Point group: D2
Chain length 339, copies 4
C-alpha cells in the first residue's frame, strides 16, 4: 500500500515540477471538432482541418510565445500533425522545452437518479491509449469532471463518482508515464454567492485528495486544474481581490504541498478578468507552497482569433496579440502584471 | 433520491420474478470468441462462426430443454444469429417463454497498487449498447466482478471499485430495460477454509447492496449471482451439507428479500458437485425468501461438448446428455434431485 | 473479521428470536425521571419515586397482561425496584417468561455545524454498564438515534454519525450479553409526503445495516425498532393500508432476513392508530421473513394512566384498561384485530 | 456546510498560530495519577497530591524555561492547583505568555472483533467539560487516538473510528473555545520497517483530514500531533537524516498548509534522539509551510525527575537540567542544535 514508485516515477516528478516553472503556464489547444466549430463561427470561418491546423500553427509558431509556456494540451488529431514545412508539432515543442499534453477523457453523461448531474466517460481502455500517447511524445494528460451547484447539488453520489473517477484516471496515467492534470470543475451557473462556492469547492477538493490517496497516486507527479472561487453567473460580481482571497484559502485548506502547481481554468471570464485574478492571487501574502499559474484556452486565444479572422494577411497582427497575452499572464504568475 | 421509477419498472419486476419461477434456471452460453476458442481447442474443433453457431443451435434446440430454463445468457454475436433453418435464436426462446440475456462487461484489468486484484471494464457507452440489446430482444444483463482471497485480499480498494462498478452498471441497465444480474465472484484460489470465505462473502455482499442503494437501484428488478461459500482450492473439501448451511446463512445476513432470486455460479465445480450443492440448499430448513436456482455455464455444457466433438453425427447423443443435466438441476431447485 | 461468536452467541440468538414469538410484543416502560414527570403532571400526580414504583407495579402485575409481552424495557431505577410485598420486578417478569430490558443511551446533543440535527450520547463506559445490567437480570438493551426530514436533512454527516453510533453500541451489547434493539427513528415533523419518508427510511436503514456489518455485529442476535413509513405531521393522512404497504416495502428492500423481528415504534400515534397500522401490516400479502410486532410506550399506557389518575381505588379498572390494550395489540401481530 | 464560523474563530486562529512561534514548543505535563505513579515508582517517591503539585511547580517555575514554551498540557488536577506561595499555575503561564492546555480524552478501550485495536473514550459531555476548562483559563486541548501496525493492522474499522473520533472531538472543542490538537499516534511497536510506517502514517493522516472536513472543522485553528516516521521498535534503526526525510515527506503529502504547526510526539525515544530528529527536520531542503516543533513529555522531563528524586534540596540542580533540555529543543526547531 505504497503510492506509485514505478519506472516513470522520477520523470513524472520532474515534468510535473517543470509545468510549475514560475513565469510559465499551459496553453489549452485541446478543443474538440465541435467546440472549435463555434470558435470558428464567431470569426465567420468554416471548420475544416486545414483551418484548424492553421490556427494551431499560428499559435505554436508565434515568435517568442513558447518562452512563456511550459506545456501545450493537444487534441489527439493535433498530436500527430505537422507544420506546413513538414515538421511535427511535437518536434517544435521538444526543441523549445515545451511539454506536449493530450486530452484523454470522453466527455460527460448524466448520472441516473440525480437532477442533471454528470459522471465522466473514458476509463475503458485508458491504459492502452496512454501508453500509445507517451510513445507519440506526450508527457501529461487532462481529464475534466463537472459538478453543479444547486438546491441539493453537488449530491454525495455526484462527488463520489467524480472523485473516484479522477483518482482512477490519475493512477492509470502515472503507470503509463503521463502526468495527470486533476480537473474538478464546479460550474459558475446559478444565483449562489461566493461563500457557497467556497464551501462546495472545499468539499469537492477534499473529496478528491482523499480518493487520490485511496488509489495510491504519487501526488508529486500530479497537477490540479480547479475553478477559481467566485459568485454565481446570476449573482453580483465581487472585487478581484476578494476572489483571490477566497480562492487561495480554499487551496490552503485542501491541497497537500506535495502537489507542485495549480493551473487555473478561467471559465467564462473575460481575457483581462482571468489575468487580473491570477495576478491578485500571487500578490497575496500568505502560505502558497505551490505555483499559481494558468491553463488558459479561450482566455489566451479569443482576441487572437478575432484579429486573425481566418486570413493569412492577418497572421502577423494576431501573433503579436497572442504574444502580448502570453507575456501578461506570465507576469500575472509573478505578481508583476499592471493592467 | 428514490429508486428507479421509470417506464421499464413494471416489466423489470415481472421479468426478474419470472427468472425465479420454480424448477427453472439460467443457461450461461455467453462465452466470448476468445473463450469458446479454448473450449473448441480441447475437442480439436475449428473456431469459426459456423461452429460457434452450430454449438449454440445444438444447445438451444435440444427437445424439451427449454422447459427447465427461464433465461439464456448470450454473447453479442449469438444474439443476432439464426438456426440453420433461418429462425433467429431469440425467436426460438421467445416461443418457449425463455428470456434472452446479454453479457455487457468488457473483462477485467489489474488495479494499480494491489497484489493482482481486478476491476471490471465496460461502463463507457453502456447505455447505448443496452438500448440496442433491448431492441434485439434481450431482457436481462450480466456483469462479472472478480475478487480474490489472500493475506490482505480482497482489499478495501478492490471492494469499493467492484461494488460501485456493479451499482453503476445495474442502474444503467434498468434505465434501458435490462434486468441486471449482480455477479460478485470470489475466487476459490488459496489454502483458506470455509469460514474465511464466509467472512469475505458477507463483507462483499454487504458492500454491494449498500452501493446499489447509493445508486438508487430498484432492487425488485435485479438478481444476484454469488459464489457459493466453500473452502479454498488448496484446502480439504467439506460435505455438501456444510457448503449449503454456510451459503444460505451468508445470504440470510446480507441480501434483502425484495430481490426475487439467486442464480448461483458453479466456478470450477464438477457437473455433479454443482447439482448436489444446489439441491442441499433447497432442502435446508431456514428462512429463504428468494428462489435459490442456477445460472450455470461449464456445469451444464462440459459433457455435452465432449460428446459432440464438433461432428453432426454426434448431435443426437449430445443433446440427450444436455437434457440430463437440465432436468437434474431443475430438480435441485425443487429439492427433488436424488443422484 | 468474523461476526460476534463470543460466549453469549447462543443466548442472544435464543432471546432475540423469543422476542418475536407470535402474539407477543414489548412494553416500553423505560421513561426517565424527566419524561415520566411530564406524563405524571398531565394526570395531576406528584413525581416522587413511590409514585413511579406504583405505576410500574400496576403495569407489570396486571393479571394476564404478561401473556401478551415477550419483553419489557426499563429505566435503571426500575431495574432494581420491588413490588410492595418485596418481590423484585425482574422476578415478576422471569416468572412470566418475560425478558427484562434496559435503556442504555444518554439522550441527544446537537451535531456541530448541522441544521438542528442530533447525535446520541452513551458510548463512554457502556461496556461496564451493560455487564452490570446483565448481572441484574437484563437480557436486551435500547438505544435511540433521531433523524429529521427537511430541505437538506437528514444530512450525510447525521446519517453516518447515527448509523455508526448504533453499530458501535450494538456490538458492545453483544459482548456483554444484551440483545441490542437498533432504533433509528425518523421524526414525522414537517410537510413532506409519504414518498419522501419512504426514501429517507430506505436510505437510513441501508446505512445502519452496512454500519452493523462493518462493526462485525451478529444480526441474528439483534432487533429493529423503526418508524412506520407515514406522511408528515403537516400533510394529509392516508389510509392505514397505504402506510402498511410502504412500510413493509421499505423493510423488504433493506433489512436482512437474519434479523428475527421488527418491534415498531408508534411515535405520536393514537393508541388505536398504532393497533390498526400494526394489524394492517400482518394481513398484507407479501414476503415478511421477520416478525412484525410492537414496542409501544405511550401507545399502551395513555388511557391506563388517565384511568388510574394516581389513585389506589382506580387500580382495578386501570388494570382492566391496560389488559384490553395488550390484548388488541397481541391480536394485531396475528392479523386478527377486528376493531373497537 | 461551512466550516466553523463562531465567536471563537479569530481567537482559535491567533492562538494556534502562537503555538508555532519560532523557537517555542509545548511541554506535555498532563500525566494522570496512574501514569505519574509509574514515574514516581522509579525514583522511589510517594504518589500523593503534594508531591505531584511539587514536580509541576518545579517545571513551571524554572527560571527562563517559559521563554522556550508556547503552551503546557495539564491534567485536570493541575489546572486548578497553585504554587507554594498561592499563585495559580494558570496565572504563572499567562504572565509569561504561555497558553494552558488540558487533556480531554478518557483513555482507550479495545475494539470488538479486532486483534487488540483501540478506540478512544471521551465524547460524552465533552462540550460541557470544554466550556468549564475555558473559564478556568485553558485555551487548547489534547485527545490521543492510538493505532498499531501488524499483519492486518491498522484495520479499516480502526482507521474510521479513530479518524472520526478526532474530528468529532475537534469540532466540539472549537465550539467551546479550545484549539484542538489532533493526535493520531501510530505506535512504533513491532518489526516493521520505515516504509511500512510511512505508508500507514500517510493513510491515517489522509483519513483524519478528510474526517476533519466532513465535520466542518476550522483547520486554521487546529494543530497536529503526529508520530515521526521511523522503523519499528524491533527493527534495525536508520540514520536521523532518513527519519527526517520520510517524516517531512509524509506530511507534505497529507497535511493542508492551512494548519499552522506540527507538535511532534517522541514515543519511546531518548531525550537526545528526539532533539536530533527534530533538528534534522528543520534543516531539510523542501517545502515546509508549517512549523515543525515539539510536544514532548518524557523527552523533556525524564532526566529532571531523576535529578530531583523528590527532594526540596535538589530543586536547584534539577531545574538546571530541565532548562538545558528546553534550550536544546528550542534550538532544534530553528536548525541550530549542535550537540
Amino acid at each position: 500500500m505504497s503510492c506509485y514508485m514505478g519506472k516513470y516515477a522520477d520523470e513524472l516528478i520532474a515534468n510535473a515540477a517543470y509545468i510549475g516553472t514560475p513565469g510559465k503556464g499551459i496553453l489549452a489547444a485541446d478543443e474538440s471538432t465541435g467546440t472549435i466549430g463555434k470558435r470558428f463561427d464567431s470569426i465567420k470561418v468554416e471548420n475544416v482541418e486545414s483551418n484548424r491546423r492553421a490556427l494551431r500553427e499560428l499559435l505554436f509558431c508565434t515568435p517568442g510565445a513558447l518562452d512563456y509556456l511550459s506545456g501545450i494540451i493537444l487534441f489527439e488529431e493535433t498530436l500527430y500533425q505537422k507544420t506546413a514545412s513538414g515538421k511535427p508539432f511535437v518536434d517544435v515543442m521538444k526543441e523549445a522545452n515545451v511539454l506536449p499534453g493530450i486530452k484523454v477523457d470522453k466527455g460527460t453523461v448524466e448520472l441516473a437518479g440525480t437532477n442533471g448531474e454528470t459522471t465522466t466517460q473514458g476509463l475503458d481502455g485508458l491504459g492502452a491509449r496512454c501508453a500509445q500517447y507517451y510513445a507519440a511524445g506526450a508527457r501529461f494528460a487532462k481529464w475534466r469532471a463537472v459538478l453543479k451547484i444547486g438546491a441539493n447539488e453537488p449530491s454525495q453520489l455526484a462527488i463520489n463518482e467524480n472523485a473516484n473517477g479522477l483518482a482512477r484516471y490519475a493512477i492509470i496515467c502515472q503507470e503509463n508515464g503521463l502526468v495527470p492534470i486533476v480537473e474538478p470543475e464546479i460550474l459558475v451557473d446559478g444565483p449562489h454567492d461566493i461563500n457557497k462556492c467556497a464551501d462546495v469547492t472545499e468539499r469537492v477538493l477534499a473529496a478528491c485528495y482523499k480518493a487520490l490517496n485511496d488509489h495510491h497516486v504519487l501526488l508529486e507527479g500530479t497537477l490540479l486544474k480547479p475553478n477559481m472561487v467566485t459568485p454565481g453567473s446570476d449573482a453580483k460580481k465581487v472585487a478581484p481581490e476578494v476572489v483571490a482571497e477566497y480562492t487561495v484559502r480554499a487551496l490552503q485548506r485542501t491541497m497537500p504541498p506535495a502537489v507542485p502547481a495549480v493551473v487555473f481554468l478561467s471559465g467564462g471570464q473575460s481575457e483581462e478578468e482571468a489575468t487580473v485574478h491570477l495576478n491578485a492571487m500571487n500578490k497575496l501574502q500568505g502560505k502558497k507552497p505551490w505555483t499559481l499559474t494558468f491553463s488558459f484556452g479561450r482566455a489566451l486565444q479569443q482576441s487572437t482569433l478575432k484579429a486573425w479572422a481566418g486570413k493569412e494577411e492577418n497572421v502577423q497582427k494576431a501573433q503579436e496579440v497572442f504574444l502580448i497575452r502570453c507575456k501578461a499572464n506570465s507576469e500575472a504568475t509573478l505578481g508583476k502584471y499592471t493592467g
